[PDB]
């Protein structure tokens, strides 16, 4: 059931959009899952991370802007 995820993100419609945003990060091949997987797809794995309380609309914006600075540091510094 998705009720545990609704308790964290109260809107319900945003839970679909935020999970769909988190799904394409793992599905396309960018990031790896934080929570240990049990042979589940990106749709279910994304929802598991909402219930535990790691990923949300706020953290994704902070994490994405962090990676922009990290990638720029990789190009500049050789070692």
């Amino acid at each position: 059931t998705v009720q545990d995820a609704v308790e964290k993100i109260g809107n319900r419609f945003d839970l679909v959009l935020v999970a769909a945003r988190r799904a394409r990060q793992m599905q396309v091949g960018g990031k790896d899952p934080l929570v240990p997987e049990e042979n589940d797809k990106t749709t279910v794995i994304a929802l598991r991370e909402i219930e535990e309380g790691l990923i949300n609309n706020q953290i994704l914006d902070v994490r994405e802007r962090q990676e922009q600075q990290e990638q720029e540091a990789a190009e500049l510094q050789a070692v």
């Binding site: 319900r12 799904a23 394409r24 589940d40 797809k41 749709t43 929802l47």
Partner: protein, 201 residues
């Protein structure tokens, strides 16, 4: 060509991906609903008994169209919004949509029934021993008039589980049906009388 390896890959492909089922007369939003597609050796599609009440589709040559949810967004939408587990309560009324209809209601009322005297008379029991004794032999299914220790519980005053067990008077069928109740609620008292109006409540 349809090789043996195709069905192995097909099971993994349809592991965590919902399929939007729908009836012919889609009046309400409850008609069009998603569910986890399981494999089955047969042409006819298997639809749940509780889901049949909301959709209103009696098994008498009634078709049900499927729909594979493509993309990442629709899979999350069907699993969250349009799922069977999520859509429990009705849209119009506050009461539960997915409930016991005909077969489930008759079976519960058949078990929870006070027969005249019957086998057993008034033999007391701990709790689980009553269900084992009634199921095996000697004691009847209905029985009626047989006190037993029921581990009651109720999350009162906003602070975890509360209350304790007590030797409440009940039927043999009511003692077996009490195990189905999940921690809280009434416990023992709710199982008595019948399951016509109180079953849905």
């Amino acid at each position: 060509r349809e090789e043996a390896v195709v069905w192995d890959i097909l099971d993994e492909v349809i592991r965590e991906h919902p399929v939007l089922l729908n009836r012919a007369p889609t009046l309400h939003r409850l008609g069009i609903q998603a569910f986890e597609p399981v494999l089955i050796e047969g042409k006819a599609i298997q639809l749940h008994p509780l889901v049949c009440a909301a959709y209103n589709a009696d098994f008498d040559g009634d078709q049900m169209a499927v729909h594979v949810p493509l993309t990442l967004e629709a899979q999350l939408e069907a699993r969250a919004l349009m799922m069977s587990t999520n859509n429990i309560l009705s849209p119009a009324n506050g009461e539960p949509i997915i409930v016991p209809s005909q077969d489930v209601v008759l079976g519960l009322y058949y078990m929870t029934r006070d027969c005249v005297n019957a086998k057993g008379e008034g033999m007391v029991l701990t709790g689980p021993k009553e269900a084992e004794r009634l199921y095996r032999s000697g004691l009847a299914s209905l029985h009626a008039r047989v006190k037993v220790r029921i581990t009651e519980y109720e999350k009162d005053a906003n602070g975890e589980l509360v209350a304790k067990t007590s030797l409440k008077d009940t039927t043999v069928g009511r003692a077996i049906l009490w195990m189905i109740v999940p921690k809280g609620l009434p416990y023992s008292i709710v199982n008595q009388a019948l399951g016509k109006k109180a079953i849905s409540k």
